[PDB]
């Protein structure tokens, strides 16, 4: 009514070590058949004498919610306040999570993912170097607009599309706390796919790979009415923080360095690094 008792007063720990003494039996825990595709459930008490240890360690920091739940930079680009080239004055980004290596490797440890998304923007501006820099420009305001697939796309900073009568936009002024908002799980499927071993056409032709399922739309950003006498360059950095996460069918982590944003493509890389012989255990 007023207060509610969702208290988790009983939290999970790591397994205790049971005291274990000598044995002489036909029962043999240490011998198994790896061939079954089974990982052994052996513990020290099975193969040696152990003392009792009340273990209070907890796996709290390794839940998928926690592992994925930190904001990571997924994109960055610059847009000028004034320039002769129309395209240098605004950013148009096709939303995806494959261009920044760190976030990509983490998400890619799972095949399917389902989560809500917290998006934070970090926008900074700097005056371009030049011969004459004296000016007195008022504070800048930026507009970030999300255009769902199929909506009208802006062709220049001053076009009608920026009216956002229906698309969601954020107007933010410099000097303030970074802009932020939440987006729910928006896939047309039941989970987001990090990989897709298939084609776009029924023919088994067309696009191949996860890129065929990426149609989340674009993010467009411009200065509001910020034309300055001497150019100023703003850089926008977008951060993603998944929350209320669920993950399915885990995969080996990416070993080879990434080469392309929209394909699994790689260059063969060795299993691991080498040492002189199979018995080398020293450093020098």
């Amino acid at each position: 009514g007023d207060v509610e008792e969702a208290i988790e007063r009983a939290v999970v720990h790591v397994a205790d070590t049971m005291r274990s003494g000598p044995s002489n039996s036909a029962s043999v825990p240490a011998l198994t058949a790896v061939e079954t595709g089974h990982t052994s459930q052996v513990t020290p008490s099975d193969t040696m004498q152990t003392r009792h240890v009340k273990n209070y360690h907890s796996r709290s920091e390794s839940t998928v919610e926690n592992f994925l739940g930190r904001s990571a930079c997924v994109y960055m680009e610059e847009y000028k306040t004034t320039d002769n080239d129309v395209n240098k004055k605004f950013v148009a980004w096709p939303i995806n999570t494959k261009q920044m290596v760190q976030m990509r490797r983490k998400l890619e440890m799972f095949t399917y993912l389902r989560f809500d998304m917290e998006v934070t923007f970090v926008i900074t501006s700097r005056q371009d170097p030049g011969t004459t820099l004296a000016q007195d420009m008022p504070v800048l305001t930026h507009q970030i607009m999300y255009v769902p697939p199929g909506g009208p796309i802006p062709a220049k900073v001053d076009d009608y599309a920026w009216q956002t009568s229906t698309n969601p936009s954020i107007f933010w002024t410099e000097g303030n706390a970074p802009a932020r908002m939440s987006i729910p799980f928006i896939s047309i499927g039941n989970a987001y796919s990090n990989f897709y071993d298939g084609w776009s056409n029924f023919d088994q032709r067309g696009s191949y790979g996860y890129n065929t399922l990426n149609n989340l739309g674009h993010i467009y950003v411009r200065h509001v009415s910020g034309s300055s006498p001497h150019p100023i360059t703003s850089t926008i950095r977008v951060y993603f923080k998944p929350k209320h996460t669920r993950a399915w069918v885990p995969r080996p982590p990416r070993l080879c360095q990434y080469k392309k944003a929209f394909s699994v493509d790689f260059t063969p890389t060795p299993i691991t690094d080498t040492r002189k012989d199979i018995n080398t255990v020293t450093t020098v």
Binding site: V14, V28, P29, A30, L31, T32, A33, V34, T39, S40, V42, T47, M48, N55, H57, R59, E61, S62, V64, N66, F67, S71, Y75, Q99, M100, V101, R105, E118, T120, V122, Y146, P168, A177, P178, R180, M181, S182, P184, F185, I188, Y239, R246, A247, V249, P250, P252, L255, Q257, Y258, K259, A261, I271, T272, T274, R275, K276, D277, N279, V281, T282
Partner: protein, 238 residues
């Protein structure tokens, strides 16, 4: 208005913060959930799964797959060493790229026991006994089977059961060790020796391979989330 006073931290963007924020798509009707097999809830579930350890990651490697094959042969000198490795699951090249090592590399602290499973892959007609040991840290690693047998060990006999599990216990002065292991946080060595020898009848190959799997036990956990040293970039992709 209600009188308030902003405290330090106000307006900052802490990457690991945990606040609420307005939803840009008010009333969006989420696609119904579906029960897909294989849900993961904790990364430790992954680290608890066996992966093949590249124990034979030696210098002269011609063929990459050779790294997974530990050589064992007939008429080996008595008490000969089969292999030796140092216990730094997150740092040593033998472990760093296994499932367990990869998970460890997203953290800075670790604690718990490990399972090293060895599987004999020779013919059904070959026989042999091996002594597999774990030596807690000390100034010097074991150089002889006599040295090795004083530590934690198991004597593996080959028969119908092809695999054997050496479970290396958590023996440490501190509750946790560093993933970026150092001398203070030293864990020791794991070595293998011929207990008797690999004997063979007529008409069977002269040498065979042994494989090594590694996974975490139920008392294992990691702490301190950090970025991994294993992935990087000089440019945005595209």
């Amino acid at each position: 208005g209600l009188p308030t006073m902003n405290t330090p931290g106000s307006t900052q963007f802490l990457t690991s913060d945990d606040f609420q924020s307005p939803c840009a798509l008010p009333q969006f009707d989420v696609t119904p959930s579906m029960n897909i097999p294989g849900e993961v809830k904790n990364l430790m579930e992954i680290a608890e799964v066996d992966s093949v350890v590249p124990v034979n990651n030696v210098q002269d490697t011609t063929d990459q797959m050779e790294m997974f094959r530990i050589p064992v042969t007939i008429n080996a000198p008595l008490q000969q060493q089969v292999f030796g490795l140092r216990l730094q699951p997150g740092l040593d090249s033998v472990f760093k790229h296994t499932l367990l090592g990869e998970i460890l590399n997203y953290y800075a602290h670790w604690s718990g026991s490990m399972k090293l499973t060895f599987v004999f892959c020779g013919s059904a007609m070959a026989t042999g006994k091996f002594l597999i040991a774990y030596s807690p840290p000390g100034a010097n690693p074991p150089k002889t089977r006599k040295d090795a047998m004083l530590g934690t060990h198991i004597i593996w006999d080959i028969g119908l059961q092809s695999s054997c599990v050496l479970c290396v216990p958590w023996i440490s002065q501190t509750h946790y060790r560093l993933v970026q292991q150092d001398e203070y946080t030293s864990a020791g060595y794991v070595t293998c020796w011929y207990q008797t020898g690999m004997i063979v009848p007529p008409g069977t190959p002269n040498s065979s391979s042994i494989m090594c799997f590694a996974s975490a036990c139920n008392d294992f956990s990691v702490r301190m989330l950090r970025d991994t040293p294993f992935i990087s970039q000089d440019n945005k992709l595209q």
